[PDB]
């Protein structure tokens, strides 16, 4: 469903991604790792659609379409959802109004209908519970007054409500402990239906103990230079990499 080939991306004229290639098929969980400065954020930013990232070469195709030509909202319509490393606060906009508007939007795109007012709520409650979220979520302003850990969990709730096809966790495990990691894991895992795919851009490896990947990839100067299955993580420990551990 997702095919990235020889991707080159620069930021403010600095070459960050230098020929990144990645293949993701339905039902797969992929983990992308590596040191800071090797492409993690540029990769996520490029896929999501940040406008300050110049693609100087390569391709990114999703569901047989050129993703790079789609605006951010259309990429979401197509099915790509990204859990932010730093979820944004939207003062004056309730989670309910936000989610409702977002759901209608992607449902419209995609050619289907949205839930029915009260149903939308039966869905929320279920998710607010799944992620141990404040029962007064719907009325509060998106992420306002939330701790970092709560913002991460909110993003997963969004993920479960908007039902995307490709879920990207952009170092969204950062700052989370075993407890939060476990709740976040229960949220993401509940989305595994054998069709949706996941890309975990790790801040650290511990998240992979709860969301076991099928594929593991290592970045080096904007390129993936090593791929394997979950067992590769233990192999990388023998390399003594400083980025491998410590949150």
């Amino acid at each position: 469903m997702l095919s990235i080939k020889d991707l080159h991306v620069s930021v403010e004229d600095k070459a960050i991604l230098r020929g990144l290639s990645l293949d993701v098929h339905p039902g797969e969980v992929h983990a992308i790792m590596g040191p800071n400065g090797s492409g993690k954020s540029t990769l996520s930013a490029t896929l999501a659609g940040r406008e300050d990232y110049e693609v100087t070469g390569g391709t990114v195709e999703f569901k047989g379409k050129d993703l790079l030509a789609l605006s951010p909202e259309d990429r979401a319509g197509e099915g790509i959802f990204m859990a932010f490393q730093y979820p944004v606060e939207i003062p004056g906009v309730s989670n309910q109004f936000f989610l409702q508007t977002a759901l209608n939007a992607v449902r419209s795109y995609r050619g289907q209908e949205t839930l029915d007012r009260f149903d939308f709520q039966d869905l929320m409650e279920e998710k607010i519970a799944l992620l141990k979220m404040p029962e007064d979520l719907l009325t509060r302003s998106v992420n306002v007054g939330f701790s970092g850990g709560e913002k991460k969990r909110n993003d997963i709730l969004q993920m479960a409500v908007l039902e995307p096809e490709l879920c990207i966790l952009d170092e969204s495990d950062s700052g989370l402990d075993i407890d939060a990691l476990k709740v976040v894991a229960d949220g993401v895992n509940s989305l595994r239906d054998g069709k949706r795919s996941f890309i975990i851009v790790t801040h650290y490896q511990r998240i992979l103990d709860y969301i076991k990947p099928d594929y593991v990839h290592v970045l080096y100067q904007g390129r993936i230079v090593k791929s394997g299955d979950f067992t590769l993580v233990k192999q990388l420990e023998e390399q003594g990499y400083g980025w491998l551990t410590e949150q």
């Binding site: 605006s71 909202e73 979401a76 606060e89 939207i90 004056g92």
Partner: protein, 416 residues
């Protein structure tokens, strides 16, 4: 063309029984003359499109169909004014409405101006009539009084001009909502002048709303006065969303203790327009609380101007006054000039002013878009959040939606 000469001519027009009050303002108008860009209060507001123009005062007539097409959807007691003239046939009856209304040119009771200035004098002198409105003691009308103004321009290079004058007396214990709505009949430019003075007696409560929604080529110069006695409450909300150049003044005097005042305004100038929102406030007695929230949203080549003077007299202890001005700039060619001015002569007070200037929060817009909301809707949601405190103060959902519709229509990611 000599603007002062032109207006002087309109004042003397054949068939005009002008009042002594109007004559005194005419003299003041000719005494003070027109300010230049060097004048303290005119560094940012252009008068070029006015000082050298031919002015005419053509009072046309419209049909209920034309009125309806421009009218707000609201259940009110509606008085209609067209090209400076009250039009009975297009207005609602006032008997039993809770509003005592008389329209004539008798001006014996009208109060003196709080802050005299050139355009206030122009309107006082050219207004063809005064709308005398009163709400008796303890009365709380069920419906808001709506003053609808329909002004039109004429073909050619001549500038049709209309000046409206209204006065409201809220007796003790009276509580009312009054709305002034201004619109253009068509695309032809015109010069609108308006002045709404209001006296708020003890224990009276005022809800004032102004909706200046005229076309992109017109000039709108207004000056409203609010006079509060003791234990009075007054809220004024202005949505300045129209005109090539708009300059609105609200001068207020708190002449009684224990009064509460709120004056808000939203300015939304678009391509090449100048929206000037100004206030003058005098805390003459102590124990009064005043709050002001003025926001602006400026689009490419637009210019918002804010000026807020607050004078706190000596002995006005326990004065609690605040003023906030938040400005949002939409493009690289947008401009904003803001000038708060505090003159505090009493120590036992709590006064403060604050102003910000910045552009829409792009990170929030991208966040909304990454979840599927298109650019236009994301932008509108954030602007509405920005103006939320002003629109919710309307305390009228039906009206709120129409004001929001006007706001949304002036955003770049909407129509431009």
């Amino acid at each position: 063309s000599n603007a002062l000469q032109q207006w002087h001519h309109l004042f003397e027009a054949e068939g005009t029984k002008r009042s002594p009050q109007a004559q005194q303002h005419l003299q003041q108008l000719l005494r003070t003359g027109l300010p230049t860009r060097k004048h303290e209060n005119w560094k940012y507001t252009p008068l070029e499109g006015l000082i050298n123009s031919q002015f005419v005062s053509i009072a046309g007539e419209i049909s209920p169909q034309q009125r309806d097409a421009l009218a707000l959807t609201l259940d009110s007691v509606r008085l209609v004014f067209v090209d400076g003239r009250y039009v009975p046939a297009l207005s609602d009856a006032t008997e039993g409405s809770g509003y005592e209304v008389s329209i004539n040119d008798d001006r014996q009771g009208l109060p003196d101006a709080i802050q005299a200035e050139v355009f206030l004098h122009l309107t006082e002198s050219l207004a063809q009539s005064v709308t005398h409105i009163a709400v008796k003691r303890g009365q709380r009308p069920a419906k808001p009084l709506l003053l609808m103004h329909i002004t039109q321009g004429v073909a050619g290079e001549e500038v049709n001009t209309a000046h409206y004058r209204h006065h409201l007396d809220l007796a003790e214990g009276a509580e009312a909502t009054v709305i002034e709505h201004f619109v253009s009949l068509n695309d032809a430019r015109h010069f609108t002048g308006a002045r709404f003075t209001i006296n708020v007696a003890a224990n009276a409560h005022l809800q004032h709303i102004k909706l200046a929604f005229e076309n992109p080529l017109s000039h709108h110069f207004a000056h409203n006065d609010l006079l509060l006695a003791e234990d009075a409450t007054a809220f004024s909300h202005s949505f300045l969303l129209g005109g090539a150049v708009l300059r609105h003044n609200t001068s207020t005097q708190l002449n009684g203790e224990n009064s509460t005042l709120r004056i808000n305004s939203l300015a939304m100038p678009v391509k090449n327009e100048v929206c000037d929102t100004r206030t003058w406030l005098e805390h003459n007695k102590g124990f009064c609380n005043s709050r002001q929230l003025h926001k602006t949203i400026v689009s490419d080549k637009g210019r918002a101007v804010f000026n807020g003077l607050i004078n706190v007299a000596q002995h006005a202890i326990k004065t609690d006054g605040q003023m906030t001005n938040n400005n949002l700039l939409m493009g690289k060619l947008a401009e904003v000039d803001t000038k708060p001015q505090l003159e505090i002569y009493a120590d036992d007070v709590k006064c403060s002013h604050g102003a910000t200037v910045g552009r829409i929060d792009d990170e929030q817009i991208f966040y909304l878009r990454s979840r599927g909301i298109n650019q236009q809707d994301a932008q509108q949601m954030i602007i509405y959040a920005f103006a939320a405190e002003l629109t919710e103060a309307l305390r009228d959902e039906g009206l709120k939606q129409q004001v929001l519709a006007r706001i949304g229509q002036r955003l770049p990611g909407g129509a431009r």
